[PDB]
Amino acid sequence: LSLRPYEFWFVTGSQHLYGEEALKQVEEHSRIMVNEWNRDSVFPFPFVFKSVVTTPEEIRRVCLEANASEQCAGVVTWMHTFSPAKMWIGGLLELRKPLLHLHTQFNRDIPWDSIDMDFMNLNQSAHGDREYGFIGARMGVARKVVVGHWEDPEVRERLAKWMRTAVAFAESRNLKVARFGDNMREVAVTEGDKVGAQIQFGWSVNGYGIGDLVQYIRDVSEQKVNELLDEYEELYDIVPAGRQEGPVRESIREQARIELGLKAFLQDGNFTAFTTTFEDLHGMKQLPGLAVQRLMAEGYGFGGEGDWKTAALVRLMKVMADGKGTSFMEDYTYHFEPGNELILGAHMLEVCPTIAATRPRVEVHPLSIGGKEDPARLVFDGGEGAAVNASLIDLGHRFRLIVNEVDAVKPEHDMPKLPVARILWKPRPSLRDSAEAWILAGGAHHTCFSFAVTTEQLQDFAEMAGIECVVINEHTSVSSFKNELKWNEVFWRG
Amino acid sequence: LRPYEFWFVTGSQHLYGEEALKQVEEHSRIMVNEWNRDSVFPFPFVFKSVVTTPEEIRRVCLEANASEQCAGVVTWMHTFSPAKMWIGGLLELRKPLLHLHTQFNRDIPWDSIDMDFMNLNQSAHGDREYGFIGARMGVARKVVVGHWEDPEVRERLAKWMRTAVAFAESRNLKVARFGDNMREVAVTEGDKVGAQIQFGWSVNGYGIGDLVQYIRDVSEQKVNELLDEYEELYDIVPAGRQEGPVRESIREQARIELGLKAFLQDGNFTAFTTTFEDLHGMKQLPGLAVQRLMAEGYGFGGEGDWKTAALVRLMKVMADGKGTSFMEDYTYHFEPGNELILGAHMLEVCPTIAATRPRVEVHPLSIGGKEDPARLVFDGGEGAAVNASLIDLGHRFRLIVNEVDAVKPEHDMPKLPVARILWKPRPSLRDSAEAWILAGGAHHTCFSFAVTTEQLQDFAEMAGIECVVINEHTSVSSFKNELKWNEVFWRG
Amino acid sequence: LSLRPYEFWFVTGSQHLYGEEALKQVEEHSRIMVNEWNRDSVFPFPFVFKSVVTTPEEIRRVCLEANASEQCAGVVTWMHTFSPAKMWIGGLLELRKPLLHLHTQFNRDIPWDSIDMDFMNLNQSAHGDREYGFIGARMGVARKVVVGHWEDPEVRERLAKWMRTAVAFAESRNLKVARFGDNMREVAVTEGDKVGAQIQFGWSVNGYGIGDLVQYIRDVSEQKVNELLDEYEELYDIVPAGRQEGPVRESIREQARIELGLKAFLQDGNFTAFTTTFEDLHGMKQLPGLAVQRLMAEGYGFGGEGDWKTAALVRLMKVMADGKGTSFMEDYTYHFEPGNELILGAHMLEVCPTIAATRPRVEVHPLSIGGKEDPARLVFDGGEGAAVNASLIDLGHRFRLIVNEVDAVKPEHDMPKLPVARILWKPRPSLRDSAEAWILAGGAHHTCFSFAVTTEQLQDFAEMAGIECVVINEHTSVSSFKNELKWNEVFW
Ligand SMILES: [Mn+2]
Ligand SMILES: [Mn+2]
Ligand SMILES: [Mn+2]
């Protein structure tokens, strides 16, 4: 599931004060930087040099162009020289693409023996970016600020990380979610204001009768079903029962039909995320399981029980990710053994095989929930490593993003009676403290779980989107966490 | 409705002795007794004790909370009744509250008035000290001033009773949604959790398939009996009186009506929604069936509009008479000196607002892509009415109320396959619509002949939401200003 | 003076989804936990199991009951399984009792060999308590949250401490203060809004003429006075000139009349706290001293100079306390010796003997303040140990609770000329910084000192009462403290 070709516009500020020659040197420096950056594979998207801007008219034009350009995912601005910031007001009011203020300098060191006035006029970001910094603060603009020399690998990795965050925000603005059925009845945290969500994030979330999907599923050709089954056998272990014709294999074959129906429905409307609900399965033989797991492994957002917020978050995080292993997740049960406290996460069927440590196995087991036939699903253990667990909730008058940093651990023991894929992890700073913090922030039971998204990225996304982001990690103290929630509350209100 | 009652609670104090307190109790008992003899009141009064200590006050407020029949509490300070004693109970009370500022005797007995009289009949100041604690605490309260035998006073009280019972119904209201919101529509979206917190409404989704199963279980005998009732209540189109396709269309609505009814009763719902975008397993869009359930007093909202469905149900309860419908502004008549709005829906207008006698008709309806639906066709009556919409502003709800005058049509509308009503909105079409749009009023409404503006304002007061009114006194420039000033008030 | 018994209601959330058999195991688990907890002596009050709730009605009913039961001091809720949180909205709107969310699990470990879908459906507090956590945050409920296994001793400690806090809050809601005389003239910090405090905390604070107390004292029988004197002799060292007959025994006898008169007045009115004032003592032979010190030893709240806020606070902390040693207190003078900085605390007369480390002696000395005769009082040195010093002030629009953690120390020198009881402490993080933070927070000069109340309890109480609680302890830096005062202020 691939992306339009995003790029990043590099805009360099200056002024006419010092003459035309100085301006040429500024332009030369900026082209060199863009050229050099583009050759570094740390960056996942190209930079494009978008000129030296020196007048209010220039600045506004490039902001206007950035807004209208679908491939422009973000703008990086750097004042090479002093660039009077009243000139930037028109542009900053216009721009609605994510903005990064790069505070840098072409040369690394001061050339002591030769530094003179011309040099001082030329290499003066030291004050040019401060004046630009002021107008940003003054206008209350959302901005990433990065400080450092432009060949410093730390600086580059921060830009590169930000690029993925900025791209996910472009995807967010155009995200379409399809709901097959409504929220699980009586459930609170999965409910919310869709209109409010479309305003804050750009998400278009709309409902379809399950019958609309049943229709697509009934148009699936058996030939394609057969091919898909072959692929299943190449990629996964199959339970012995399903190896030859008979009822177990027919159940697997049914999920194959569901997978193809979904893929078709979702592609036809250009949806990149979807929800189902076990409370509305009219005309289906099974709750989608294997089928949803496969679609998640291709990067679709998914949320159980009509949970569109998590479905959206899962898709965003898939785009943010610089690597494998992102999934819809739900905390299921705890292990409270002193000195070895952990959480077992899973869902009744739907966990993404990208987080798997072991070769996934196709199994068929009864599932009374939903009152349908025994669904086929992938069963596997999650891998180990540092990860984030994130939930996005609706507080009524605004949204809150909650992120827990965790460490997934390998299971030491088999769970042979457990028919679902699952993962274990120890939340930071402890089970007790993170759970308490989580509950105090009202974090959901559904999350996006990812080995490949960082806390900084989620916080950057929240800035772009104009919402609160709270983090629970190794440094968290519950008492300070509570105060922060109160103080953040007054700030984000209204 | 369930049985409802209203608690009269009289305040006093121990200062003037035990005999004084017996006299205030006699007065309070007599008032309740006389009130109960008057037909103006839709529910009975219950005399609760005279309360004179914080414990008694708190105890009666707790009981009112626990009592499902108690729809509201009417409080009156017969004598001075030190208001700190009232803090505890007011902190606890979750039933609507009316402060009746009244007096047993109407006139000052000039020739005999003495200090005993002055100690006993001093609501003039007792109710003011109580009024302070109400304001000081920010209690939502209705305040009525006048003598307890004044017909205006009783009439005000009786109307508030209806509002308070609507509120009690609101707090237990269950809506069933068959299918989701019409796709891409904004005004009918909103936060169900927020709504359950604010009004008590329970809004939950079911597959259209859940309803189909019910419709399929309908007794064919029951259908035939219902089909006959139709023949008796309505003018059926000629083609429909004989066996044939048309009569079969009418028969389908009968099955739909019976299946809906059964579903609703099973889950004790009093409002429901449908959407034409999700009718898998259905032969037609519910039409005639919805119109009848609306006549029985069910709330309904088209296109998954749960806010409107609940509003419709609420107003059906507030109403002291006939004629309450889900409604949508469909088209304008901009003829100078005769501007009006024609309201209707695809099918679903309530026959309780009919002037004429409803005709059962069958016409093609391309919306939803199902078979020709049977429905009741009629003209709406004439009269003063209200048209109300309840919207979600993101952080809070806003109730919007336009006062209007319904008018009988002067020209026939022979090609128009749906029931309709015509109204002239106060103060004019141009200003009413401008105000409605600035307030973000919805296209879906509840239209009623039998609900007053006062009632809707009292309900909004009970629920803790803004109520914006558009009437003959409305000026748009002023109106715009008040939205701003209200905004800063109701903003959390 | 003795504390009413209370209980704690344990309610467990579940749902119908998994069938009746799973609901039976939920109930079995919950019964087992309540039974096992009630065997554990760490809990000062019992749990009562109050059903597994699975519908909006059940949830609503049990919160309504919880509200109306005077024996119920708190509710402890645990979602054993997923328990959809819109069902909880109605009950949460109803509950005014303190609420603790216990995030626990019946089994401590995952049974790796056995775990299957049944187990996953049953023991899913991991997500059920999160959905529940959301609705509490979404609705802005004041809640204590405790996480860990139900057999973890630390978990049980936390629940236990909170039980005492919750019981102090119940007492708070019914607390009645008697004031004998007004505030000391021109004093600011002891003044406040009594109405606002009754709304916020529940306290009833009312004034009586000193003459009222005087009538009670005059009614005391001399026989009782004689018996009280014998108890003085048995509990305390009496100054030798006081054991004989004469003026100073007569002075001790006069304090015993006051004690008995006071005790009788307070009991007749159900008061559990009181204030006196040296400026209004008409009819009294002495400023109450020994008398007050004895009432405080019984657990009565006291505040000097008409200070009702501290009197109330002292009483609440007496209830909160899980051990001996709680007193009204005033910083009187400093010791600025380098490396040995400390505060000497005392009052005119009134320091509770429960903080004493020496056996109190009954002594008689002149007191010019008040213009009355030489009062008898108890004299002693307070003991060493970690404690808190707390003040509650009125900022005009809201209350602020201020708590300083301190370390009481043994005096190295006798104070032979000092006629009052006293205690020395070293405030955290240092005298200089502590005092600066205290003054910035505007903390009173009158406090409640206690060896037996934790900061966590006072913080939990403030949360129950909906007020700011500022803590000054070893970690305080003044600059950071200033910031938080500003940020808290915008929130509150
Ligand atoms: Mn789930
Ligand atoms: Mn419509
Ligand atoms: Mn003092």
Swiss-Prot record, chain A:
Classification via InterPro entries: Ara_Isoase_C, AraA_central, AraA_N, AraA_N_sf, Fuc/Ara_isomerase_C, Fucose_isomerase_N/cen_sf, Lara_isomerase
Membrane-spanning intervals of the chain: none
MF annotations from Gene Ontology: L-arabinose isomerase activity; manganese ion binding
Cofactor stoichiometry and binding remark: Binds 1 Mn(2+) ion per subunit.
Required cofactor names: Mn(2+)
GO cellular component: cytosol
Catalytic activity, EC: 5.3.1.4
Keywords for the protein's UniProt record, in alphabetical order: Arabinose catabolism, Carbohydrate metabolism, Isomerase, Manganese, Metal-binding
One Pfam family matching this protein: AraA_N
Example GO BP: L-arabinose catabolic process to xylulose 5-phosphate
Top-level lineage group: Bacteria
Binding locations of Mn(2+): E305, E330, H347, H446
Pathway: Carbohydrate degradation; L-arabinose degradation via L-ribulose; D-xylulose 5-phosphate from L-arabinose (bacterial route): step 1/3
Reaction it catalyzes: beta-L-arabinopyranose = L-ribulose
Family the entry assigns: Belongs to the arabinose isomerase family.
Function as written in the Swiss-Prot or TrEMBL entry: Catalyzes the conversion of L-arabinose to L-ribulose.
Listed PANTHER family: L-ARABINOSE ISOMERASE (PTHR38464:SF1)
Name this polypeptide is given: L-arabinose isomerase
Species this chain originates from: Geobacillus kaustophilus (strain HTA426)
From Swiss-Prot, chain B:
Cofactor(s) essential for the protein: Mn(2+)
Keyword Isomerase: yes
Signal peptide stretch: none
Disulfide bonds: none
Protein family according to the UniProt entry: Belongs to the arabinose isomerase family.
UniProt xrefs under NCBIfam families: PRK02929.1 (NF002795)
Protein name as catalogued: L-arabinose isomerase
Species assigned in the record: Geobacillus kaustophilus (strain HTA426)
Taxonomy of the source species: Bacteria, Bacillati, Bacillota, Bacilli, Bacillales
